Structure formats: C-alpha cells, structure tokens
Write a protein that binds this ligand. Structure first.
Ligand SMILES: Nc1nc2c(ncn2[C@@H]2O[C@H](COP(=O)(O)OP(=O)(O)OP(=O)(O)O)[C@@H](O)[C@H]2O)c(=O)[nH]1
Ligand SMILES: Nc1nc2c(ncn2[C@@H]2O[C@H](COP(=O)(O)OP(=O)(O)OP(=O)(O)O)[C@@H](O)[C@H]2O)c(=O)[nH]1
Ligand SMILES: Nc1nc2c(ncn2[C@@H]2O[C@H](COP(=O)(O)OP(=O)(O)O)[C@@H](O)[C@H]2O)c(=O)[nH]1
Lengths: 434, 426, 434
C-alpha cells in the first residue's frame, strides 16, 4: 500500500527523530523492543506507511539515520530504542564537518553518499505506493546544509515525481550559536529551491514564549522542545495513519499550499498548547482555539504576522469536532478584518477534520485535550524574515571574514556571489505577487 | 370560520392570558395536551374560534407570545398549561425595554416586529375570513407599551377592515407604579386614538378594593387578580362560543357603544362578587344582581360613577334567566337614575343574553359601561405628563434614543382634545 | 443568555469581592472548590449570568481581579476560594502606587492595562446578552482612583451602550485614614462623570451605627463590614438570578433613577438589619420595616436625609410579600409629610417584589428574616455631602501641601483647577433642579 520513508541527517535529524518515532510507538501501541502487543491490533489500523512486517509483528521503521559523527548515534545504540531500528539502516560517519559547507558537501559526504542511496533503493523497492520523504535537517550544519543540498540533488534524479517534505529550524536573528549560520543559510537556500517541494521553519524563541507563559516551563531544554515539534509532525500524519471523514495526503498539501514554485515556504502553529492545570478552569471550544490560531503569541516563527499577508492558510483539526461551527468560525475570522489576504486569493482555505484527538506523551508537560489545530499559514512575513538574515550575511562577507575555511575544502568563492542575486529576487517576489 | 388571534406583549399581558387561557381551556373541556374531555358537545361545536386542530385533536391555542427577554418565556413554559402552546410562536429578543418607549418602538422593537409579522400573517392565511384581533399588553411599562403600540400601526396595513381589542392596564391616581408612567401613557394613547377600536381601562388600585370588600382576601396573589380579569374577558365572547336566545358578536358590542371614532374607552364590570361564607345569605335574583352592577364597588377602575353619565349600558347576562325581569329592571334603572345617563340618547340599555352561565355560578352578569367620568382618567395623567416636561427631566433617555420634543406636544394637544369630547355631551 | 461581568480594582475590590462571590456560592448551592453538588440543580435556576460551564458543572466566575500589589491577591491564592477562580483572570501588579493619582493613572497602570482589556474581550465574546459591569473601587486609592477613571475611559470606547455599575465607599468627613482622600475624590469625580452610568456610596460610620445598636457588634472589623454590603449587592441580583412576579434589570435601574445625566448618584439602605435575638420578640410586618426605611438611623451614608429632598426613591422587596399593604404603606408614607419631594416629580416610585427571602451567611451575626428592603434614594442630601468634602480639598490646595508627589509622576497642576469649576456647578445643580 502507501509507504513513506524518513531520512534523518544531522544532529537535529537525530533527536527530533528520537521523539517522533518515540511518539508513534504510543499512538499505535507498539512496544519499543520491536514487536507489538496483541491488544493493539485494533488500534493498528492502516499503520503500514512506516513499518514493515517481519516474522511475527516485528516492525522496523522505514527510517534512515545519517550522521558524520558517531557520538549521538550511540545514544540510540544505548537506550531502549536500540532494538527497534535496523542496523544497516544506521550508516555512521567518523570525521566531523564542523558546520562547514564543503566539508559536508564534498569531504566526508562523498565517501558515504553511495552507501546510503543504496539503502534508500533497498527499502523503496518494496513500495507500490511510495508517497513522500521526511528529511530532517538544519540550516547551519555541515551535513545539515552541505550534504542535505547534495542529497536532494540526487533523489530528484532517481524518483522525481514523488513528493518530499523538509522540517528544519529557522535561525533566530538575536539568539543563535554558530557564527557561520548566516553563511550556510544562504548556501542551503541556493540549490534547494529547485530540489525541494516544501520546507518548514520554526524558531527556538517562539517555542520558548509558549513554554514560559502557557506551559509554565521555566527550565526547558532540548528534551521538551523535541516533544512540541513532534506533535506538529504527528498531526500531519493523522490524516494518513487513520480513517477520517475529510482528510488529505501529501501530494494534496503541496497542491494547495504552493501558489508559485519558488515561494513554497510556510510555517506551523499549534493550539491549545498550555500546561495541565489551566485546561481545568476553561472549556476550550472550536471558536476558542481557532481564534487563538491567528494571534502573534501562537506562531512558531518569531516574526510579525500582521505585517505579513496571508495567501493560503491550511487547517487540520483533530478530535471530535462538528463542521457547523467550523463553517462559522472560519467565516467569523472573515468577519474580522485584521486577517489580510491578497486581492486575487479569497479561496485559499483547506478543511481537514480527523476523528482521533491528540494523545499526550507519558510523563510530559502537556494535557489531554480533544481539540487541537495544526495551523499552516504561508504569508509575506517570511520576506521580513528574509531581510533580517540577508543583513547578517553580506556585511560579514564584505570584510571576507571566515573565508579561509571555505577555500581549501574544494569550494569556490563566486558561488557566494551567485546566491546573493538568487536570494535578492526571492524576497522581491513576496512583494511582486503581493 | 370567524377567527380571532390573541397576542401578548410585555410582562403584564404575558401573565394575564396565562391564567385566562386556563378558564377558556376549562369552559370547553380540554386538557394541557389539548385532549377534548367535554361530556356534552356544546363545549365542542364552537371550539374552532380560538384553536387550530391538527393531527389527532391536540388543539393549539391561536396565540402569539412575544417578549424582549427570555425571562417570561420559561415561566409560562414550565408553569401551568405549558405543554399546550405551539413552540413555533415562541419568538423573542435579547434586549429588555428597560421601561423606554423609543427602545420598544424605534430601537429594539423595530427588530423583532418583522418576525411575528409573518406569524400574524401565517395563521391568518389558513382561515377563510378573519374577524378581529384581541391584544393584552401594558400602558405603564416599556415593553408592551412600546412594542405593542407599534403592532397596531401595522395590522391596519394588512387588515384595514376588522376590529382591534387592545386590553391594557392603566395608571391609578393614588400610587404610581413606575417612574416614567405618565410618559408611557400619553405617548401610547397618541397611537391608541389613531387605529384602535376599544380599550378597557382597568386600574390596578381598585382591583384590591374589589378583593378587600367582596372577596375579603388578605393575601392578593397575582394569579387571583388576573383571575378577575380572566372571567371578565370570557363573558364578552360568550355569544361566539355558545348559543342562546340572543347572540351578539364583538362587532355588535362595538357598533352599539362607540358614538364617535375617539370615544371608545370603556370600563368593565362583573357580578356576582363576594367571599365564601356569604353564599346562602343573599339572593340570586335578577334584582340583587342588578344593583350590584351599578355600584361604585363594581367599578373595576378607580373612577367615581356618580361623577359621570352612562351613555351605552351593555348587559351581557349569563345563565338561564327570565327575559321579562331583565326587561323589567333595565327600565327601572332609568326611572331611578335619569340624571346618571346622558339625556339626548334614549334607551341606553343594550341587552345580550346567552343561556349558559360561567363555571362556578348559576347566574352571572358581565357589564361594560361608558361613564363620562373616565374623562378624569385623562385629566389626572395629563397633569403628571406635564409635571416633568416643564423641567425637561428624563429627556436623555428619549432624545438619546432619538425622540422629538414635538412628539410630546403633538400627543399633548391630542390628549387635551380628548377630554373636550367627553365635555361636548356631558 | 444574559451574562454580567465583574471587575475588582483595588484592595476594596479584593475583599468585597471575597464576600459577594462567597455569598453567591451559598445562594445557588455551589461548592467553593469549583464544581457543584447535584442536589443544587433545581436551586440553580437561571444562574448563567455569572458562571460559565466547563466540562462537568465546573463554574468559573465571570470576574476579573485587578491589583497593583500581589499581597492581598495571595490571600485568594491561599484560602479555599483559590480553585474557584481562573488563573489568567487574576492579573497582578508588583510595584505599588501608594494612593497617588499619576502613579495609578500612568505609572504601573499603563504597563498592565493592555493585559486586562484582552481578558475583558476574551470573556465578553461568549456573551449574547451582555448587560452590565460590576466595577468595585475606592475614591482615594492609587488604582482606586487613577486606574478606575482610566478604565472607564476605555470601555465606553469599546462597548458604549451597555450598562455599568460602580460600588464604592463614601469618605467620612470625620473619621478616615489617608490624607490624600480629599485630593483623589475630586480627581475620581473629574472624568468619571462622563464615563459612569451610576456610582454608589456608603459610609464606614453609618455601617457602625447599626452594628453597635442593632447588631450589637462591639468588635467590628473589615470582616463583618464586607458581609453587610454584600447583602445590598445580592438583593439587586435577586431581581435577575431568580423568577419574580415584578422584577427589574440593570438597564431599567438607570432609566428610573437618573433624572439628569450628571446627577446620577443615589445611595443604599437595608432593613431589617438587627441581631439574632431581637427578631424573636417582634413580628416584623411590611409596614414595620418600610417605615424603618425612611428614618435617619437607617441610611448607609451619614448625612441629613430630612435636609435632603427625595427625587426618585427605588424599592426592591424580597420574600413572600403581598402587594396590598405595599400599595398601602407607600401611600401611608405619603400620608406623612416629612418625606419631601420636588414639585415636578410625584411619580418617582419603583415597585419590585421577589419571591426569594434573603438567606443569611453561615456563622454570621444576622438572622433569617423573610422580609427585607433594599432602599435606593437619590436625594439632595448628596449636595450637603459635597460641601463637607469641597471644604477639605481647597484649603490644603491653597497652601500647596503634598503637591511634590503629584509633580514628577507625569501629571499637571492645572488639572486640579479645572476640577474645581467642575465640582462647583455639580452641587449647584441639586439646588438648581431642586
Ligand atoms: N533545537 C535543536 N537544534 C539542533 C539540534 N541539533 C542540531 N541543531 C541545530 O543545528 C544547527 C547546526 O547544525 P548541526 O546539527 O550542529 O551540525 P550537523 O547538522 O550535524 O552538520 P555537521 O556540521 O556536518 O555535523 C544548530 O544551529 C542547531 O540549532 C537539536 O538537537 N535541537
Ligand atoms: N472597609 C474597607 N475599606 C477598604 C478596604 N480596602 C480598602 N478600603 C478603602 O480604600 C481606601 C483607599 O484605597 P486603598 O485600598 O487603601 O488603596 P488601593 O485601592 O489599593 O490603591 P493603591 O494606592 O494603588 O494601592 C481606604 O480609604 C479604605 O477605606 C477594606 O478591605 N475594607
Ligand atoms: N394582576 C397582575 N398585574 C400585573 C402582574 N404583573 C404585572 N402587572 C401589572 O403590569 C403593570 C406593569 O407593566 P409591565 O408589563 O410589568 O411593565 P413592562 O414589562 O415594562 O411593559 C403594573 O401596573 C402591574 O400592575 C401580575 O402578575 N398580575
């Protein structure tokens, strides 16, 4: 049937995948050792998109772990989730690229790219309904940028027509770690425009704002930030892993949300995202959280949504939701005038309601709420998020700082110049279409 | 055939009918399910006049229930005979008038008038030929005196032919009930003298004086005060619902009384009225029931009957009676009380006798009179209306709604011409 | 249906609200933890004006607690009534204004006014029958005067037509605490004439006179004074919370009791207000306590009611009262001639009788009496209560004492002069209309 493959490249690929595949074992009733208990067969209704069958219910994830460094991969090969994954699906590196492009685009990647594309083809030949790709990466990583652009340069030659999905983290304009992240974000945007269907972005700080105010988590780290992103990942798959009245597959997401083949970069949002106590004193209706979707304390990228112009807003609901107030509240959004559209698209809405409510992680900070919304809103606030990063790249480039690492690794300096004219017209097209 | 709807608006008229439909339910032998349990078909052969039978005999009353708030809806709905009313008619708003005429007329009443206008249309489309409307509301409050005021101004556009019964309570000289009570009177009667056919000025004050002397009741429940309003209204329409030796519809009650197109302001009366223990000690003769009808005690309004003149005496007698003793004594009152009548109108007595008494008696009398001492009802309110306009108080509750100052004075001139017309023939 | 929101600003807003919402839990049968017992559903007849429903009978109060100081708010967050209220409805301050206008009108208020007006709008959008506002404040408080005038300056922009009600304490001419109370009472009268429908006043001493003589409470404090005021609050709501034969909503109160849009300041009175023993040797009839309404030992503001002229006296009865002696006793009041009216208003009476008698607080000092009257009497004795406070304000202003706190906090001194000409013609209008 339909079967979807996931690829995890970089350390952000490692631990986000350590949460998403951890979460899916809860939502299908699969024990982490590798087999299933017999009670979760009725829950296991069309789980075939990720898990091959082996011998007696033993379910390997159709997932590939790619890293140039063996350290964080051994965390998978130490914990409980060691026996779940397949060993020859784990392909490790030895020498690190250290957030450098040609160290991750030519040096260690080209010794390992031929090993992993076989493991792509070894697994994908079982498919008769191969839909899409979950590729997880960063923007400033050596293998996060240098290998990811090269990997998407090769799978479009192989499979082409079949879809792709990229999840990543938007680098914050104020608080971020690596100094080469303004460099590599221009590099990972250069040749991945042509080789990616859609790519999503989240902020470190925009997670933190709801963590401190609504979750009331005043000591967050990369443990709980992986759980919050994984709920957004799981809510997309709920249209596919279960039987809904009006649901949507991966080819349909890009068909609605891509108005032009270059501007295809929306973001995410999730609500209700609060702690376990505040849901007790409040009855969260449909009109409650849907109006909570379109306020700037709910976006997952810290920018100005009111200074952006909405073009195609996508909505996926979960839980037992009636469509009457849905057909009212989205109309009640249209009664408000602050939600600005473009003049040519009034019909940029998507309706999706699944029967299954989201189930929370065990021992987590969330609360069991029936209603939830995964808001996807492509807008022109991405252009205002382009200018904050195009300011960082050029001024460090003008003094030619940190160029002496990019030179000797098999890389040219004129490629920095061509990406400048490439990204200049990109943020222009938000204002040209808008 | 001859069909009449009954419409209630405002907190006063909504609870008057709530006890009044019960007697109409009980005089014709039906149930809160509408199940006919009358033993004789005399209680069935004119059941159609206030009912529309549908789907195995659950009779629904031809009634419309309007309020500006859902407060009075559920109390009638959960109260006695709540299952009898059709839930199609439960039309209401969410404002409340707050005792303001221009809210009930211009601001809030203008929204809810459209919904029940089709409801007035709907039950009138399913009949062959309508007969007239009966309306219970207030003149002191804000909801019924503001919204039911405007309703009569749109009935004449639909039906400029039939009659309009506008039963409403009136202020008393002793104790005012609301603060803007002279404001709710002059502005309402300004529209009542334009397009209405009868009003029954019932004082809230004198109804206790009926209960304090005749009934001797120390605890006046509001179910019991409207119960004396209930038996008054059922005696008026006894001809259309019951046979007899002389039948007289509402138009015959109209045409005999009103002499000029303004003077139709009548006070009602009812006899017998007494407590429990004085049943056997008095006489149930024509003579004993006669002189009770012409006392100041039986004046349901607090106006003095020997300070006016009876123009048209309407005697709606109920029960198996001797016609000649009715013919005897109605002569004898004018041989006694010739000063108490208007002089130039001969034979002031109109007599209609149905041979069926109400439930609970053996012989009753339903009186409606026309004293010209009801001129003093509009004398006392025209000074209280002009008591506060001279200081322009409460103008920011009306002009803030958008009321004209000339809307006061145009009503004020037509209020003072009204008492000149009682003065014309007194 | 109809739904009314309460706002509590200042420490007088805190503990008076700690009594009124405490009392309403008794009169509807709601347990203070947040849920209801199933026995009190038949008692719970049209309780929807204050309490949203949540999950299973869990009833949050439509109430907002506003304070610049977190101390007395923590008393709510320590006692039994912590779990009843909603946490994001509690918005606290940190730095105190200390009974100063521009410290409560500009300084700490303008950092918190944008947080609370959202919580107004978050709750009021559920309403289809939004009637009025219970705003509780003082006259000499920093947030009692400076924030209260600013708050009513903004809600009239938002909602406008919908009604408002203010409860407050009249500052006594002899016994009061803060020296700036003659200053701030002129300030809280300045711009709240335009932005308030009605505002009520009570005296500390006029409570004490009935407490010592009739209640025989010779150690009273702010515990029992909150219970006595709350009975006057509850008696107004009995026209709305229950089903009465002739009752009255909040739009109707201002329609009867406001003859002119500036003079709209009546006061309250309550009777029978005695101890638990003296009601045993006495049969309190209708003519007993109604004649007790109009004697100067029963008014809740210590002034001269016989030197005032009654203009619109409002009466709300509670308990099983027949209307016959009502129509007699108010006429029997008119048989007496000491009750003076104005020449143009004989018809300034209001009739209200509810079926439910007042129920007394558990462990309190009151007695279960069926009959009770909440007398409201707008009169020209308010003007004599203006001159006692206009004498205090001007003479301390003439020496310019205590001005050196008002200067540097963002405030002008000519605003003191304009309020003098504003309050001079106000007390003139009692004699002009009278
Ligand atoms: N929040 C979060 N961000 C991560 C995590 N792992 C990597 N990142 C992001 O990845 C960005 C840089 O990429 P890296 O993961 O450090 O390097 P890489 O992708 O493994 O590529 P190499 O340099 O070849 O090792 C940083 O800016 C981080 O924000 C993670 O576990 N949590
Ligand atoms: N009876 C009584 N009066 C109170 C109470 N709390 C405050 N007040 C009155 O409030 C008036 C002054 O306002 P405060 O409460 O002291 O100050 P505030 O309203 O909190 O404003 P800030 O100065 O900004 O703190 C005093 O004159 C008191 O009479 C109370 O609990 N009981
Ligand atoms: N007998 C009786 N009269 C009532 C009752 N309720 C109201 N009234 C009368 O109605 C008049 C007030 O009008 P009302 O409809 O309540 O005010 P509105 O709602 O603003 O129109 C008063 O004079 C009352 O005497 C009742 O239950 N019984």
């Amino acid at each position: 049937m339909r079967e979807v493959i996931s690829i995890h490249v970089g350390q952000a690929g490692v631990q986000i995948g350590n949460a998403c595949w951890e979460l899916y074992c809860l939502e299908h009733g699969i024990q982490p050792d590798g087999t299933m208990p017999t009670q979760s067969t009725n829950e296991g209704e069309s789980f075939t998109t990720f898990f091959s069958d082996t011998g007696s219910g033993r379910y390997v994830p159709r997932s590939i772990f790619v890293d140039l460094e063996p350290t964080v991969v051994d965390e998978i090969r130490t914990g409980t989730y060691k026996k779940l994954f397949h060993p020859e699906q784990m392909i490790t590196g030895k020498e690190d690229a250290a957030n450098n492009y040609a160290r991750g685009h030519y040096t260690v990647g080209k010794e390992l790219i031929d090993t992993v594309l076989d493991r792509i083809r070894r697994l994908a030949d079982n498919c008769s309904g191969l839909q899409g790709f979950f590729v997880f990466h960063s923007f400033g990583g050596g293998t996060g940028s240098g290998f990811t652009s090269l990997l998407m340069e090769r799978l479009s030659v192989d499979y082409g027509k079949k879809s792709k999905l990229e999840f990543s983290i938007y680098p914050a304009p104020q608080v971020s770690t690596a100094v080469v992240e303004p460099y590599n974000s221009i590099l990972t945007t250069h040749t991945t425009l042509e080789h990616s269907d859609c790519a999503f972005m989240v902020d470190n700080e925009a997670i933190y704002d709801i963590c401190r105010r609504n979750l009331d988590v005043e000591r967050p780290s990369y443990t709980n930030l992986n759980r919050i992103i994984s709920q957004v990942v799981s809510s997309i798959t709920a249209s596919l892993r279960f039987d809904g009245a009006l649901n949507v597959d991966l080819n349909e997401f890009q068909t609605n949300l891509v108005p032009y083949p270059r501007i295809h970069f929306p973001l995410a949002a999730y609500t209700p995202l609060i702690s376990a106590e505040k849901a007790y004193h409040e009855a969260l209706s449909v009109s409650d959280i849907t109006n909570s979707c379109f306020e700037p304390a709910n976006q997952m990228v810290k920018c100005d949504p009111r200074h952006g112009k909405y073009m195609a807003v996508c909505l996926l609901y979960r839980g037992d939701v009636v469509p009457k107030d849905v057909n009212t509240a989205i109309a009640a959004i249209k009664t408000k005038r602050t939600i600005q559209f473009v003049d040519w698209c009034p019909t940029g809405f998507k309706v999706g309601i699944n029967y299954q409510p989201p189930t929370v992680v065990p021992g987590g900070d969330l609360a069991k709420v029936p209603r939830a919304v995964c808001m996807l809103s492509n807008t022109t606030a991405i252009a205002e998020a382009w200018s904050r990063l195009d300011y960082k790249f050029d001024l460090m480039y003008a003094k030619r700082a940190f160029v002496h690492w990019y030179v000797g690794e098999g890389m040219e300096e004129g490629e920095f110049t061509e990406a400048r004219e490439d990204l200049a017209a990109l943020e222009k097209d938000y204002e040209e279409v808008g | 055939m001859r069909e009449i709807v009954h419409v209630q608006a405002g907190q006063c008229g909504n609870q008057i009918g709530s006890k009044f439909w019960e007697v109409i339910s009980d005089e014709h032998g039906i149930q809160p399910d509408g199940t006919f349990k009358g033993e004789t078909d005399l209680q069935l052969e004119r059941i159609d006049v206030y009912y529309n039978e549908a789907n195995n005999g659950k009779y629904v009353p031809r009634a419309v229930l309007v309020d500006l708030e859902p407060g009075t809806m559920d109390s009638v709905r959960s109260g006695p005979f709540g299952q009898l009313f059709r839930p199609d008619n439960f039309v209401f708003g969410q404002s409340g008038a707050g005792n303001n005429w221009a809210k009930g007329h211009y601001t809030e009443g203008a929204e809810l008038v459209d919904n029940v206008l089709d409801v007035i249309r709907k039950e009138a489309e399913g009949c062959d030929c309508l007969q007239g409307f009966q309306l219970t509301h207030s003149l002191g409050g804000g909801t019924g005196s503001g919204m039911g005021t405007l309703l009569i101004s749109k009935i004449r556009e639909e039906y400029p032919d039939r009659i309009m019964s506008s039963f409403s309570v009136v202020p008393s000289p002793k104790v005012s009930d609301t603060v803007v009570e002279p404001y709710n009177a002059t502005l309402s009667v300004h529209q009542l003298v334009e397009n209405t056919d009868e009003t029954y000025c019932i004082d809230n004050e004198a109804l206790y004086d009926i209960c304090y002397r005749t009934l001797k009741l120390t605890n006046p429940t509001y179910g019991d005060l409207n119960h004396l309003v209930s038996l008054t209204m059922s005696g008026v329409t006894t001809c259309l619902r019951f046979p007899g030796q002389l039948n007289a519809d509402l138009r015959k009650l109209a045409v005999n009384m009103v002499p000029f197109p303004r003077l139709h302001f009548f006070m009602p009366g009812f006899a017998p009225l007494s407590a429990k223990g004085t049943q056997a000690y008095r006489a149930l003769t024509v003579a004993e029931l006669t002189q009770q009808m012409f006392d100041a005690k039986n004046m349901m309004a607090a106006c003095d009957p020997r300070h006016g003149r009876y123009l048209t005496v309407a005697a709606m007698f109920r029960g198996r009676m001797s016609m000649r003793e009715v013919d005897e004594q109605m002569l004898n009152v004018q041989n006694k009380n010739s000063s108490y009548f208007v002089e130039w109108i001969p034979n002031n007595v109109k007599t209609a006798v149905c041979d069926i008494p109400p439930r609970g008696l053996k012989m009753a009398a339903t009186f409606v009179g026309n004293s010209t001492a009801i001129q003093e009802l509009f004398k006392r309110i025209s000074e209280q209306f002009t008591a506060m306009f001279r200081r322009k108080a409460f103008l920011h509750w009306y002009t803030g709604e958008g009321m004209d100052e000339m809307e006061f004075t145009e009503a004020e001139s037509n209020m003072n011409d009204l008492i000149s017309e009682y003065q014309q023939y007194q």
